Design an enzyme around this catalytic site. Structure first.
Site, mmCIF file in Angstrom:
data_model
loop_
_atom_site.group_PDB
_atom_site.id
_atom_site.type_symbol
_atom_site.label_atom_id
_atom_site.label_comp_id
_atom_site.label_asym_id
_atom_site.label_seq_id
_atom_site.Cartn_x
_atom_site.Cartn_y
_atom_site.Cartn_z
ATOM 1 C CG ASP A 1 54.777 22.649 44.412
ATOM 2 O OD1 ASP A 1 55.264 22.403 45.541
ATOM 3 O OD2 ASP A 1 54.613 21.812 43.532
ATOM 4 C CD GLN B 1 67.888 24.424 38.788
ATOM 5 O OE1 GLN B 1 67.231 25.294 39.353
ATOM 6 N NE2 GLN B 1 67.444 23.191 38.655
ATOM 7 C CG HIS C 1 51.614 20.844 48.333
ATOM 8 N ND1 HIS C 1 52.322 21.432 49.339
ATOM 9 C CD2 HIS C 1 52.485 20.630 47.330
ATOM 10 C CE1 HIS C 1 53.584 21.571 48.949
ATOM 11 N NE2 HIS C 1 53.713 21.086 47.723
ATOM 12 C CG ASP C 2 54.450 17.735 47.728
ATOM 13 O OD1 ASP C 2 53.808 17.194 46.822
ATOM 14 O OD2 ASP C 2 55.281 18.620 47.506
ATOM 15 C CG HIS D 1 58.895 16.419 47.186
ATOM 16 N ND1 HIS D 1 59.805 16.165 46.195
ATOM 17 C CD2 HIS D 1 57.950 17.226 46.648
ATOM 18 C CE1 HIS D 1 59.429 16.790 45.096
ATOM 19 N NE2 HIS D 1 58.284 17.429 45.340
ATOM 20 C CG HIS E 1 58.083 21.362 49.597
ATOM 21 N ND1 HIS E 1 58.428 22.318 48.665
ATOM 22 C CD2 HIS E 1 57.021 20.705 49.084
ATOM 23 C CE1 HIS E 1 57.606 22.239 47.632
ATOM 24 N NE2 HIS E 1 56.746 21.252 47.861
HETATM 25 C C1 LIG Z 1 64.369 19.873 32.997
HETATM 26 N N1 LIG Z 1 65.640 19.696 33.676
HETATM 27 N N2 LIG Z 1 66.754 19.050 33.177
HETATM 28 C C2 LIG Z 1 67.711 19.114 34.144
HETATM 29 N N3 LIG Z 1 69.039 18.597 34.069
HETATM 30 C C3 LIG Z 1 69.587 18.158 32.823
HETATM 31 C C4 LIG Z 1 70.928 17.587 33.172
HETATM 32 C C5 LIG Z 1 71.291 18.197 34.477
HETATM 33 C C6 LIG Z 1 70.121 19.013 34.903
HETATM 34 N N4 LIG Z 1 67.208 19.781 35.206
HETATM 35 C C7 LIG Z 1 65.925 20.120 34.918
HETATM 36 C C8 LIG Z 1 65.018 20.817 35.864
HETATM 37 C C9 LIG Z 1 65.486 20.973 37.123
HETATM 38 C C10 LIG Z 1 64.546 21.465 38.151
HETATM 39 N N5 LIG Z 1 63.278 20.975 38.298
HETATM 40 C C11 LIG Z 1 62.652 21.593 39.338
HETATM 41 C C12 LIG Z 1 61.253 21.399 39.939
HETATM 42 C C13 LIG Z 1 60.850 22.221 41.056
HETATM 43 C C14 LIG Z 1 61.789 23.206 41.536
HETATM 44 CL CL1 LIG Z 1 61.356 24.245 42.818
HETATM 45 C C15 LIG Z 1 63.125 23.396 40.948
HETATM 46 N N6 LIG Z 1 63.540 22.529 39.817
HETATM 47 N N7 LIG Z 1 64.728 22.451 39.083
HETATM 48 MG MG LIG Z 2 53.747 17.429 44.919
HETATM 49 ZN ZN LIG Z 3 55.396 20.414 46.483
#
Ligand SMILES: Cn1nc(N2CCCC2)nc1/C=C/c1nc2ccc(Cl)cn2n1
Ligand SMILES: [Mg+2]
Ligand SMILES: [Zn+2]
Length: 313
Positions: free
Chosen positions: A217, A269, A106-107, A68, A72
């Site tokens: 974003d 992911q 925005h951040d 962030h 970004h």
């Molecule tokens: C729901 N969840 N749960 C996990 N983990 C569970 C155990 C290990 C991984 N990971 C996510 C989301 C990852 C995630 N969040 C964002 C936000 C913005 C952008 Cl650009 C990319 N990501 N990637």
């Molecule tokens: Mg933000």
């Molecule tokens: Zn952002």
């Protein structure tokens, strides 16, 4: 007056594509941003001296956190630039001006923690702003910087054009609160399917700009696979740091932020791509057909995460 920003040939070409990476040379990011304002808006939109001083004060107010950060900020502005240039005639002079600024800002002053962590820590900003905590802070910081001497890049706007553009920026920055994205997209889904979606309705434009902001974003998932993969390392370094801090307050973090659950990253992911990114770029492509490359790129990277799980890398 007659002072064009130009970029080396490879950047001049690749910057017009959705998947462009702004590269590792920090000192070129400002010129890249000015270049995008000049092609997106005109060389007359902002007094150059004021723009440069605004860009440098914004840069100064982003912090050295893994994800962030100032990089970004300019990545999200470039994605917005790609959307605006592939949909030339759908947007006002004021929207083009405000939305690139909105994305850069925005951040602003992000500390690398979620709204949740602020609320559980009982940070002062959580008392002052009960919802969209960091995002109200970001807008507030944008207004602060705009009010510095020689920083008012909107000085030439009328009194009411000024109010309109600050209101575009505020809604734009609030919309980057992913908690608001889910319902914003459901509503846009329904309105497009029933055919009720009308771009002369100001509340409809607002929602559509809201979706564009989520799209920009999240644009780290719409890049070439090596950029997407490496950006994911910076994203988890923040998330895991936050989880550490959650544990310091005596709370089990969500798995997302638990660094003891590294192994589950590829499946995490997958969830994110399926629950958030794909639906986002799907609905956006329906409303703005020329944004299809963001959808295609997102799908490609989803397929690369499946490949990781299947031990094929
Ligand atoms: C729901 N969840 N749960 C996990 N983990 C569970 C155990 C290990 C991984 N990971 C996510 C989301 C990852 C995630 N969040 C964002 C936000 C913005 C952008 Cl650009 C990319 N990501 N990637
Ligand atoms: Mg933000
Ligand atoms: Zn952002």
């Amino acid at each position: 007056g007659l002072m064009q920003f130009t970029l080396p040939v490879r950047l001049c070409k690749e910057i017009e594509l959705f998947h462009f990476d702004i590269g590792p040379f920090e000192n070129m990011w400002p010129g890249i941003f000015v270049y995008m304002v000049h092609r997106s808006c005109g060389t007359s939109c902002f007094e150059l001296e004021k723009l440069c001083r605004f860009i440098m004060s914004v840069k100064k107010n982003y912090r050295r956190v893994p994800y962030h950060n100032w990089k970004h900020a300019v990545t999200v502005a470039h994605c917005m630039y790609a959307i605006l240039q592939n949909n030339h005639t759908l947007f006002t002079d004021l929207e083009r001006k405000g939305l690139l600024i909105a994305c850069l800002c925005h951040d602003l002053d992000h500390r690398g923690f979620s709204n949740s962590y602020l609320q559980k820590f009982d940070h002062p900003l959580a008392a002052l702003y009960s919802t969209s905590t960091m995002e109200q802070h970001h807008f507030s910081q944008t207004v602060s910087i705009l009010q510095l001497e020689g920083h008012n890049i909107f000085s030439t706007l009328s009194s009411s054009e000024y109010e309109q553009v600050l209101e575009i920026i505020r809604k734009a920055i609030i919309a980057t609160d992913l908690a608001l994205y889910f319902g914003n997209r459901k509503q846009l889904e329904e309105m497009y399917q029933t055919g009720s979606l009308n771009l002369n309705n100001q509340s409809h434009r607002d929602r559509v700009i809201g979706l564009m902001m989520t799209a920009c974003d999240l644009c780290s998932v719409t890049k070439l696979w090596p950029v997407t993969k490496l950006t994911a390392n910076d994203i988890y370094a923040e998330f895991w740091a936050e989880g550490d801090e959650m544990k310091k307050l005596g709370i089990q973090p969500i798995p997302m932020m638990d660094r003891d659950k590294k192994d589950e990253v590829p499946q995490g992911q997958l969830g994110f791509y399926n629950a958030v990114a794909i639906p986002c770029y799907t609905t956006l492509t329906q409303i703005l057909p020329p944004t299809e490359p963001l959808l295609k790129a997102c799908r490609d990277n989803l397929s690369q995460w499946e490949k990781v799980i299947r031990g094929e890398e």
